[PDB]
Amino acid sequence: VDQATLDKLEAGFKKLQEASDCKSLLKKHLTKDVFDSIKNKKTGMGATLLDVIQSGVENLDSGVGIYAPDAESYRTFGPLFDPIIDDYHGGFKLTDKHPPKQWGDINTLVGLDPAGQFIISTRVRCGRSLQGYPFNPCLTAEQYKEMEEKVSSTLSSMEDELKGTYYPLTGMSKATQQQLIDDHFLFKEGDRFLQTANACRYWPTGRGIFHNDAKTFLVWVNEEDHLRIISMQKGGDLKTVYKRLVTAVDNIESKLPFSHDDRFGFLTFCPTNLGTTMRASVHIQLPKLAKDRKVLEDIASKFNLQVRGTRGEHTESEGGVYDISNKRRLGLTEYQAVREMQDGILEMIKMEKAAA
Ligand SMILES: Nc1ncnc2c1ncn2[C@@H]1O[C@H](COP(=O)(O)OP(=O)(O)O)[C@@H](O)[C@H]1O
Numbered sequence: 115v116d117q118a119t120l121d122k123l124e125a126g127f128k129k130l131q132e133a134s135d136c137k138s139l140l141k142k143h144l145t146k147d148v149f150d151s152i153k154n155k156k157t158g159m160g161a162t163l164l165d166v167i168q169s170g171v172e173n174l175d176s177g178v179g180i181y182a183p184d185a186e187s188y189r190t191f192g193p194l195f196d197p198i199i200d201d202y203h204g205g206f207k208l209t210d211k212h213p214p215k216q217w218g219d220i221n222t223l224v225g226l227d228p229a230g231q232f233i234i235s236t237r238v239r240c241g242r243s244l245q246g247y248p249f250n251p252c253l254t255a256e257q258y259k260e261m262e263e264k265v266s267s268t269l270s271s272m273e274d275e276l277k278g279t280y281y282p283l284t285g286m287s288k289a290t291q292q293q294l295i296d297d298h299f300l301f302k303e304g305d306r307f308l309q310t311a312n313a314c315r316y317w318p319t320g321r322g323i324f325h326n327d328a329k330t331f332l333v334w335v336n337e338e339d340h341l342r343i344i345s346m347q348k349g350g351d352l353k354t355v356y357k358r359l360v361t362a363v364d365n366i367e368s369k370l371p372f373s374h375d376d377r378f379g380f381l382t383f384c385p386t387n388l389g390t391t392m393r394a395s396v397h398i399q400l401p402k403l404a405k406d407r408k409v410l411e412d413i414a415s416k417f418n419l420q421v422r423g424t425r426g427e428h429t430e431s432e433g434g435v436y437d438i439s440n441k442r443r444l445g446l447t448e449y450q451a452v453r454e455m456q457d458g459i460l461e462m463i464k465m466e467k468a469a470a
């Protein structure tokens with residue numbers, strides 16, 4: 115690592131230390147002991163510690179604040195990643211390893227709010243990274259297009275309920291893009307956390323969305339992860355939403371090789387998405403409990419749930435609609451992750467019903 119980068123690293127570390135309003139896992143876990151032991155290391159593709167932490171240093175309102183520029187980073191910068199991973203996912207020791215993939219018995223899942231009194235819509239997503247390619251900060255324009263081609267060709271072979279069309283972002287009018295974002299289907303553009311991680315280079319080249327006609331099955335191409343695979347619909351029928359996702363993922367996996375790690379499970383760009391990579395969420399109205407976002411978040415955390423705004427993370431609630439989802443993704447099976455969301459939401463609804 116050259117001196118120019120070391121100087122920037124030193125400057126970055128001091129900013130973290132001195133920022134007392136900062137509450138990120140990066141600030142918590144990047145001690146001088148940890149920093150000194152990894153600050154001179156470099157991965158095989160040239161990623162340095164600066165590439166890992168810069169988003170967290172530039173955005174002190176970060177909750178996590180680090181990203182993996184390549185797969186090797188998870189090990190090279192292990193002394194930083196490991197404790198953050200343990201903290202975020204609720205206990206994952208140096209000796210732990212993520213369990214093998216297990217979708218579980220779908221028939222044991224339930225519809226969440228049959229009367230339709232609370233839940234507006236249910237969504238389950240996973241992330242996948244393609245074998246042989248690095249994460250966003252290390253990709254060339256040529257690689258973004260090559261991956262786009264590989265993925266869109268594969269998706270063109272989906273059938274039946276999952277048959278759909280691929281829409282590149284480059285070919286999309288501003289009006290169409292905005293409508294798809296407003297209706298919760300498409301990823302937003304210009305995320306400052308991703309931008310400062312050097313994760314949006316060459317935008318919008320190689321980025322797009324695949325979906326079926328009903329927009330119940332969607333795939334995002336080259337946003338935060340190489341693939342995000344999404345099943346969603348109005349109402350609370352988690353069993354149907356999840357079953358569609360399982361079918362889609364199993365189908366795609368037989369056609370595209372994904373990066374899997376013996377310890378971390380499926381590899382992703384942000385460590386909060388490792389393992390199952392699963393985020394199962396509802397858009398839900400809890401008028402009595404959500405009088406105060408703070409009390410809502412406190413209750414949620416008791417059930418290992420996270421709370422996000424209506425348009426996704428780092429947004430506000432619109433009309434009292436919150437996004438509530440399982441927080442943990444590593445160290446438990448896919449079935450356990452979707453169960454943690456189902457069981458927690460059922461308890462939160464019970465609490466809402468008894469609330470004054
Ligand atoms: N249960 C849900 N129903 C409808 N839209 C949702 C739901 N959960 C998340 N979303 C939408 O998904 C999009 C992505 O939000 P984000 O917080 O970045 O999640 P992700 O982990 O999929 O990237 C946003 O438009 C958000 O409104």
Ligand SMILES: NC(=[NH2+])NCCC[C@H](N)C(=O)O
Nearest residue numbers: 176177178179180307384386
């Ligand atoms: N999509 C994600 N990886 N979200 C979690 C991290 C987002 C942002 N970097 C933060 O530290 O708050």
Ligand SMILES: [Mg+2]
Nearest residue numbers: 301338426427
């Ligand atoms: Mg997102």
